[PDB]
């Protein structure tokens, strides 16, 4: 349950599903995903939040709202901010996924949020073009789908 009548009635999410939150900037994409994590403070689903290429102040605000709403004790926060190395931003989603998999392999349920999968693709493109690897469509590497 995300706690939103529009999503929980017309666009339901099941345990083990991958549901994409897509849209332009400043429309509530983070708002919707953070409220979905806050709603799991009583369900029994442990949550993980991966911040990729975000501002440090934005990351700090989200952590405060999670503790103010009583949801931080169930959440794991993985942060790779906008000034950190492209290698760390490209690897943060796999580190957070590994922490979430700890619960799935032992018979438990978990929820993972990737704050900007488009910022992970920009970080991986930088590393690829600095290793002189031929580029494709929109200058992204040939294995961007596989990332």
């Amino acid at each position: 349950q995300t706690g939103y009548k529009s999503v929980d009635a017309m666009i339901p999410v099941g345990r083990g599903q991958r549901e994409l939150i897509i849209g332009d900037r400043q429309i509530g994409k983070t708002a919707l995903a953070v409220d979905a994590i806050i709603n799991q403070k009583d369900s029994g689903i442990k949550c993980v939040y991966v911040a990729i290429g975000q501002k440090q102040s934005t990351i700090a605000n989200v952590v405060r709202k999670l503790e103010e709403n009583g949801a931080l004790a169930n959440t794991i926060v993985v942060a790779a901010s906008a000034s950190e190395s492209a290698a760390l931003q490209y690897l943060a989603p796999y580190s957070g996924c590994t922490m979430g998999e700890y619960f799935r392999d032992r018979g438990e349920d978990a929820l993972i949020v990737y704050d900007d999968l488009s910022k992970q693709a920009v970080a991986y493109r930088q590393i690829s073009l600095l290793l002189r690897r031929p580029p494709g469509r929109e200058a992204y590497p040939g294995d961007v789908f596989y990332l």
Binding site: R25, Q26, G53, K55, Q56, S57, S81, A82, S83, E84, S85, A86, K119, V122, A123, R125, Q126, L129, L130, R132, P135, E138, A139
Partner: protein
């Protein structure tokens, strides 16, 4: 950064953030690195992040930054505008049309925006007053086309009352600055946020409907409009 450590709140003005991006593109080409989308440097987001992440509010002081922004080929989806907008908290637009009207500050109240314009940050009162001013100014811009195409006699009594409040609001957005005394021929004014909210809230509610619009031009706080009208 030094002044912030001293215990101060500091203003950092950057003459043009697009030229910072271009200088990075030029250096990246000179060093022989493989270019990215639209010909920018592969390090575009990291070079912007290294600069923009130092500008923050710490536990000692706070560096606030005003940055002029240029948009290539009028395209807001171009990598440079796209990357910069990701680190902006507010957008101030200066309008050539507003300047002709005579409002020298020239900030466009409809196109300019801020991420802080949220009731969960500035409280319900400031938010409702600001959104009230923007609603009345929007309706007046629509009514002005009606008055031009069909005439002022075609409008309802309620719409003509709105036009009168909108005009008073539009002039009350003006202010004499201490650095502009040479141009305005009048002394400068520093209005507080409390005085700003109270003045616009009163004009929206109609507490000043009897005063002439000119009394609300280049005055500062709302008590100064009352007196400028008395004479």
């Amino acid at each position: 950064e030094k002044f912030r450590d001293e215990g101060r709140d500091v203003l950092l003005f950057i003459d043009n953030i697009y030229r910072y991006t271009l200088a990075g593109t030029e250096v990246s080409a000179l060093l022989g690195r493989m270019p990215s989308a639209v010909g920018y440097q592969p390090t575009l987001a990291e070079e912007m992040g290294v600069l923009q992440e130092r500008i923050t509010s710490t536990k000692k002081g706070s560096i606030t930054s005003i940055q002029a922004v240029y948009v290539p080929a009028d395209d807001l989806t171009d990598p440079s505008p796209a990357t910069t907008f990701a680190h902006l908290d507010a957008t101030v637009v200066l309008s050539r049309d507003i300047a002709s009207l005579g409002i020298y500050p020239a900030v466009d109240p409809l196109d300019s925006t801020s991420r802080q314009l949220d009731p969960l940050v500035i409280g319900q009162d400031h938010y409702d007053t600001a959104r009230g001013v923007q609603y009345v100014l929007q309706r007046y811009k629509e009514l002005k086309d009606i008055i031009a195409i069909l005439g002022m006699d075609e409008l309802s009594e309620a719409d003509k009352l709105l036009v009168a409040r909108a005009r008073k609001i539009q002039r009350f957005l003006s202010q004499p600055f201490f650095v502009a005394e040479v141009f305005t021929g009048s002394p400068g004014k520093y209005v507080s946020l409390k005085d700003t909210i109270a003045g616009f809230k009163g004009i929206l509610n109609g507490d000043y409907d009897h005063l002439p619009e000119q009394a609300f031009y280049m005055v500062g706080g709302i008590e100064e409009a009352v007196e400028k009208a008395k004479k």
